[PDB]
Symmetry: C3
Subunit: 132 residues, 3 copies
Amino acid sequence: FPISQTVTVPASASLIFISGTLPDLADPHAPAGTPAAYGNTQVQTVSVFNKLRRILQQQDLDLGDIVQLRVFLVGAEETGGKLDFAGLQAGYTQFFGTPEQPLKPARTALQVVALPLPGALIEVEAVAARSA
Amino acid sequence: FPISQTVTVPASASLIFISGTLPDLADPHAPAGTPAAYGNTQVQTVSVFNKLRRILQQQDLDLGDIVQLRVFLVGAEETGGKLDFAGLQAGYTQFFGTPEQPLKPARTALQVVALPLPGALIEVEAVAARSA
Amino acid sequence: FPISQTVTVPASASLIFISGTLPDLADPHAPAGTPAAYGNTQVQTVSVFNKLRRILQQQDLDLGDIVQLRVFLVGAEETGGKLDFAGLQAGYTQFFGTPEQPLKPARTALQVVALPLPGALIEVEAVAARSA
């Protein structure tokens, strides 16, 4: 699997907690607050992890410094109102366990009722570590 | 926004993990286990953060020591079964980013199906830090 | 209650983040992906905490080193589509606050829409600490 069962953080490392992160607008022609504005689950997943990368780089860190990831999905039309786990994985495997970014955080992923942003199908929460 | 995108915790600080916190009874005349016993989303939000303050003060800490907040909402009648995000924010902005309590933790907020306590519309989980 | 309101972790301790943990197959005769394959909420809860114990023991730790637990439940037929909180507690009290394992982590428990594994009624996320 593209995740670590456990991730150990040394006591000498500082933790960085990251607020829930929602996708960026993908289609400025689409009606406001619609899934079309942000993409299907795969496209929104790509957007959220791009954004998380930018957040971390602002702290001189990157996606490989993430030690824990929590993924909240809402149901998608492609999967009949169930979470689109395949689309999540298709986006996710582009950012973790890759040649460019080989590290894999601990992860939890599940389906919730709704996210505060209309049109959003995914929100991602993270904890990162900065070594001594 | 009244939240921090990221919060960094020094490695020399101790972490305090706080169990999921549910509102206190607001109306002792209301029928048991009803939303009326606890209030609408705003009132329950105020109650939960009052309670979190008391929990922290028992540890000689306060709401400004919170580094991460996770808010689980259930749907409300005022908002047609969607989470009442406006009411959450109306309660939340009374405890964080205020003159009395200027610090803003990292936060995630989302809608779940149900909370273990009947009548509860919000449950809040937190991590706090105690500096060296 | 069988949980700690707060758990404090010294800054000298290392943290271990554990990915979301789902139950093991309980009945190899049952049809794939059904709740019968894994058990009711109580049986699945027992399975998940057995598995978490094994994960920790692989790191030379055990369930008493858990400082925070997050429990995501899906609705059960025994409880009319609400989370089966009684079954969770019946399984949970066998692993925490017992003579064999007296320590009680901070905990949050709530009902979500769906888990990525068909048939699963519970997924558990954890953080553990290794003292200096």
